[PDB]
Paper text:
Intriguingly, the autophagy adapter p62/SQSTM1/Sequestosome-1 was recently reported to recognize N-degrons, the N-end rule substrates of the well-characterized UPS, and where ultimately these substrates are delivered to ALS8,9. p62 is a key selective autophagy adapter that plays a role in the degradation of various cellular constituents such as misfolded proteins and their aggregates, malfunctioning organelles, and invading pathogens. Intriguingly, it was recently reported that the central ZZ-domain in p62 plays a critical role in the recognition of N-terminal arginylated BiP/GRP78 by the Arg-tRNA transferase ATE1. Here, we present the high resolution structures of the ZZ-domain of p62 in complex with 8 different N-degrons including type-1 and type-2, and subsequently identify key determinants involved in the unusual recognition.
However, an understanding of the manner by which the ZZ-domain binds to type-2 substrates is problematic since there is no deep hydrophobic pocket in the ZZ-domain, which is known to be involved in the recognition mode for type-2 N-degrons. Therefore, we determined the structure of the ZZ-domain in complex with a variety of N-degrons comprising three type-1 N-degrons and five type-2 N-degrons. As described for the R-BiP complex, two aspartic acid residues, Asp129 and Asp149, bind to the α-amino group, and Asp147 forms a hydrogen bond with the first peptide bond, which means that these interactions are conserved in all different N-terminal residues. However, the side chain of the N-terminal residue of the N-degron is recognized differently. Furthermore, the hydrophobic side chain of Ile127 guides the orientation of the side chain of the primary residue. Therefore, relatively small and branched hydrophobic residues at the primary position might provide very weak (or no) interactions with the binding patch of the ZZ-domain.
Numbering used by the authors: -3 to 47
The structure:
Amino acid sequence: IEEEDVICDGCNGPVVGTRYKCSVCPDYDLCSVCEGKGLHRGHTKLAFPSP
Ligand SMILES: [Zn+2]
Ligand SMILES: [Zn+2]
């Protein structure tokens, strides 16, 4: 099966459960562990469910 997946831009792990996305940039995603690191500082990240 070949499918589109959401991959964490902080650690390359799967983004499952809560998905953090940049409020400004398209195609930016963090898992909940990496969001706690504060990555992509300067842009607010938004909490969403994951696909
Ligand atoms: Zn991560
Ligand atoms: Zn951004």
